[PDB]
Ligand SMILES: *[C@@H]1O[C@H](CO)[C@@H](O[C@@H]2O[C@H](CO)[C@@H](O)[C@H](O)[C@H]2NC(C)=O)[C@H](O)[C@H]1NC(C)=O
Ligand SMILES: *[C@@H]1O[C@H](CO)[C@@H](O[C@@H]2O[C@H](CO)[C@@H](O)[C@H](O)[C@H]2NC(C)=O)[C@H](O)[C@H]1NC(C)=O
Ligand SMILES: *[C@@H]1O[C@H](CO)[C@@H](O[C@@H]2O[C@H](CO)[C@@H](O)[C@H](O)[C@H]2NC(C)=O)[C@H](O)[C@H]1NC(C)=O
């Protein structure tokens with residue numbers, strides 16, 4: 001999660017983190033991509049029938 | 050371009066960037082490496098022949114219709130209609146070498162096209178191989194594999210008629226060849242109906258060419274995020290540097306501009322690392338494609354489930370924007386009867 | 392594990408063209424493979440037919456091809472020119488000869504037929520020593 | 525240039541990318557509001573009676589010329605405490621409004637004026653915001669304001685129910701209640717008069733003299749400004765590179781006419797990249813479009829230093845009718861324009877190349893260029909750029925009754941090289 005690890009349970013830290021743009025959005029995109037291809041690995045290796 | 054992207058239109062910023070060191074020089078070296086390797090991939094995939102073979106004018110392949118995949122003389126280019134369908138279906142291709150400076154000043158809608166986001170030193174370079182020569186390579190491969198048997202990957206090309214060529218292909222599966230000589234018309238009609246249904250299926254759905262669309266979509270998304278990320282304040286006073294130079298003195302503003310420059314180089318290096326990872330993945334996929342090109346076409350693969358579902362008979366290559374499309378012609382057993390064995 | 396310890400049937404994997412074997416050599420941070428490969432030399436052209444029918448019955452080879460020099464017909468392996476009289480090792484009959492296209496006529500001399508024609512030529516002469524006179 | 529960027533004297537045969545080119549500007553333009561009267565700061569700074577800490581006076585100043593050059597000696601400005609904007613370059617910025625808030629405070633607690641300092645004069649009387657832009661001037665007033673009988677005129681506060689948000693003022697004075705008993709009355713348990721008079725005479729301790737203080741506040745990049753520096757105007761230039769300075773916005777490029785329509789309060793135009801592109805001139809009210817001049821990468825194609833020094837120069841993706849605009853004197857940042865007055869120039873798909881010549885015959889590729897174009901060092905010696913040869917065309921006759929069978933063979937030996945282990949390391 002973008003907010004929890006860095007500026008969790010604090011409003012002002014999230015406010016100053018809002019300036020940085022789409023860093024953790026790119027982080028979430030990369031992690032969701034590796035998750036979906038991680039599922040795709042098992043789907044490719046175990047669904048030959 | 051590091052100087053324009055990080056320290057555009059400021060002499061003192063360029064001096065302070067030259068003071069930092071050899072960062073963007075290393076970045077440029079890595080980008081030349083990725084570009085040269087990327088040209089090398091397309092070079093080594095399609096250079097499996099040394100002579101550009103000419104297709105014969107005779108189009109009677111023993112009752113086997115083939116006009117879908119051979120090049121069309123009526124077209125000004127040497128493109129087959131299947132290749133044209135593949136090319137115009139993915140209508141998001143490269144346009145980085147088309148927009149010249151007149152197109153930049155064309156003022157379409159306040160210059161909101163890609164020229165606005167390529168003003169910040171980002172440049173797309175055209176590939177060495179053009180479309181017509183790639184199509185010529187594919188036509189040469191198809192011409193070699195259609196008449197000269199499969200021996201043309203082992204030196205010289207020896208002409209073999211199509212009938213006993215397919216008979217040998219049956220002999221390399223487990224069924225004796227003679228049966229092909231009683232089922233010639235039926236097998237030809239099945240081949241023609243199947244090759245028509247391929248074009249029908251490609252023209253049917255719009256969710257079949259995702260495997261090439263995702264690459265260019267990811268590339269465009271990476272560039273868009275890079276050009277969008279410049280609006281970040283990075284803890285400075287303003288996101289524009291000339292205001293900082295014209296507002297604060299040169300004995301306190303160096304800290305803020307230092308933070309801004311370090312943040313922008315951090316984002317640039319993150320982009321470079323992501324590009325390296327995608328390059329490694331594309332390199333592995335291209336090597337696998339080269340193996341498929343060498344084994345499933347220039348010969349018949351005894352491995353099961355490597356050149357198509359079922360027992361593989363033969364194959365066809367076709368070009369595509371940043372990609373290759375294989376047509377695997379394969380054998381599938383039909384309905385069965387059970388008896389008593391011993 | 393694949394090229395050195397056995398012959399590879401995968402084309403263009405352990406050398407250009409047909410593959411025979413490979414030898415390894417060491418190098419500073421690397422290995423050097425010496426592949427020994429077999430490549431066909433200059434060729435010759437012939438006229439071919441897909442099958443042959445003699446007694447109203449088709450015949451086929453299970454490896455090789457029928458080739459003609461304009462006068463006689465021979466069976467030949469694919470990757471080396473060697474004409475030969477018809478072989479039982481490449482002759483089997485599957486149906487009559489009115490359905491296939493491109494077939495010609497010739498006497499058939501696969502050693503099954505020399506069992507009556509020429510392999511028992513001494514026995515044929517022994518049989519004809521009594522019937523003919 | 526390629527020896528400088530490759531750090532080696534002997535460069536190998538090939539193509540090398542080098543430093544990009546740029547189009548130098550020609551002159552500079554400044555366009556400011558043209559007002560005649562000076563800003564009336566004299567009656568603010570030389571008022572006979574100033575204001576109290578709880579009732580500071582606030583004046584907005586507009587429609588004049590910000591001229592602080594005469595404000596250097598006169599109104600000597602003992603404090604250089606300006607941190608939001610550097611006071612030396614104050615005249616180079618344009619402010620949409622300026623507000624002067626003045627009062628008289630105890631001379632000891634000057635530093636309580638700065639933001640973030642707590643207490644009673646900075647909490648219960650007046651406080652600055654967190655992101656405040658502007659600065660304060662503080663100086664001593666002992667000869668004028670302070671009397672031998674005591675300047676008993678300015679009233680300070682020492683208590684409030686809660687801390688007040690900044691930029692807020694109160695007028696009401698009520699006897700306090702600080703308990704369960706509603707002590708309204710006239711006096712009692714913490715029932716005192718709110719604002720108390722000063723006790724300042726010059727015979728007191730050092731730093732206890734009354735001080736005159738005045739804070740100046742202003743906001744930037746909001747609206748077309750009405751008060752800024754005395755810089756003269758000039759003439760507008762169309763479709764030519766120039767260093768423009770609009771209201772402190774300094775940039776370099778060309779200015780064209782745009783067909784977009786603004787709003788009466790809108791002044792600046794933005795884009796997705798957070799860069800100004802469309803501006804409206806303060807004097808004449810049309811729409812101006814900003815665009816920096818073109819540039820691009822530079823590549824050099826050379827044979828080895830073992831061979832001759834004849835090179836070729838390629839420009840990255842530029843229209844070749846626009847590169848003669850780059851061919852002038854004192855026009856380009858790369859000073860090596862000696863080759864810019866060169867030879868015949870031939871256009872490819874990624875720019876146009878100077879120093880070679882097309883040949884319609886085809887050779888094998890040696891140097892990558894792009895779009896199937898390849899360069900070589902060949903015939904007299906020169907550099908030739910030609911179309912890449914895909915190979916030798918060889919028709920093969922298809923037959924339905926013939927066969928090609930090899931009669932001889934050969935055995936050959938091929939080498940392969942594979943890396944197996946890169947060198948280990950540790951740090
Ligand atoms: C080979 O296939 C092509 C494509 O199916 C055939 O071209 C079509 O032929 C039919 C009738 O012969 C026409 O009605 C279509 O208009 C043709 N299509 C196009 C795109 O022109 C071709 O005739 C076939 N040739 C042989 C010898 O079977
Ligand atoms: C062979 O397959 C058939 C059908 O899958 C099995 O069913 C028997 O054969 C036919 C149906 O095709 C019926 O007439 C019989 O009554 C079926 N049952 C039996 C018990 O013979 C059959 O079992 C399979 N095996 C054999 C050896 O025939
Ligand atoms: C800059 O000064 C000029 C000269 O005073 C102003 O020009 C006036 O307005 C228009 C053009 O803007 C001229 O045609 C008038 O003749 C001028 N009138 C007067 C009384 O000078 C111009 O408005 C000034 N620009 C700004 C932004 O104040």
Ligand SMILES: *[C@@H]1O[C@H](CO)[C@@H](O[C@@H]2O[C@H](CO)[C@@H](O)[C@H](O)[C@H]2NC(C)=O)[C@H](O)[C@H]1NC(C)=O
Pocket residue numbers: 685686688689692
């Ligand atoms: C504006 O006036 C209101 C009164 O209506 C102030 O609110 C009071 O704040 C004190 C602070 O402790 C409370 O004890 C009172 O109960 C509040 N009044 C009411 C009616 O709730 C408010 O503080 C004033 N604004 C400022 C900035 O001081």
Ligand SMILES: *[C@@H]1O[C@H](CO)[C@@H](O[C@@H]2O[C@H](CO)[C@@H](O)[C@H](O)[C@H]2NC(C)=O)[C@H](O)[C@H]1NC(C)=O
Pocket residue numbers: 931932933
């Ligand atoms: C296949 O080609 C080889 C290579 O030329 C032939 O070997 C030559 O044979 C002649 C005949 O005695 C010799 O004079 C040459 O010296 C041989 N060449 C070499 C390099 O040793 C070989 O004879 C050919 N095979 C056939 C069946 O013609």
Ligand SMILES: *[C@@H]1O[C@H](CO)[C@@H](O)[C@H](O)[C@H]1NC(C)=O
Pocket residue numbers: 436437926
């Ligand atoms: C056999 O092949 C050769 C190869 O070029 C050709 O010249 C010749 O005409 C062919 N013979 C026949 C009968 O087609």
Ligand SMILES: *[C@@H]1O[C@H](CO)[C@@H](O)[C@H](O)[C@H]1NC(C)=O
Pocket residue numbers: 566569570598
């Ligand atoms: C303001 O007062 C100071 C000191 O009283 C004086 O030096 C200055 O001239 C005055 N300003 C003007 C404009 O007269």
Ligand SMILES: *[C@@H]1O[C@H](CO)[C@@H](O)[C@H](O)[C@H]1NC(C)=O
Pocket residue numbers: 830
């Ligand atoms: C230039 O190259 C040649 C061979 O290509 C070589 O013999 C010669 O020594 C080289 N020149 C120098 C100065 O090394």
Ligand SMILES: *[C@@H]1O[C@H](CO)[C@@H](O)[C@H](O)[C@H]1NC(C)=O
Pocket residue numbers: 149151842843844845871872875876
């Ligand atoms: C430059 O633009 C013009 C537009 O009229 C075009 O004709 C010309 O080919 C372009 N130059 C190059 C080198 O592409």
Ligand SMILES: *[C@@H]1O[C@H](CO)[C@@H](O)[C@H](O)[C@H]1NC(C)=O
Pocket residue numbers: 883884
């Ligand atoms: C190449 O072709 C062009 C266009 O036809 C012509 O102008 C030029 O002279 C030709 N050059 C040669 C060497 O044939």
Ligand SMILES: *[C@@H]1O[C@H](CO)[C@@H](O)[C@H](O)[C@H]1NC(C)=O
Pocket residue numbers: 107109493924
């Ligand atoms: C072989 O092909 C030719 C055309 O190239 C054709 O005229 C001829 O009929 C074909 N022969 C057979 C036996 O099909």
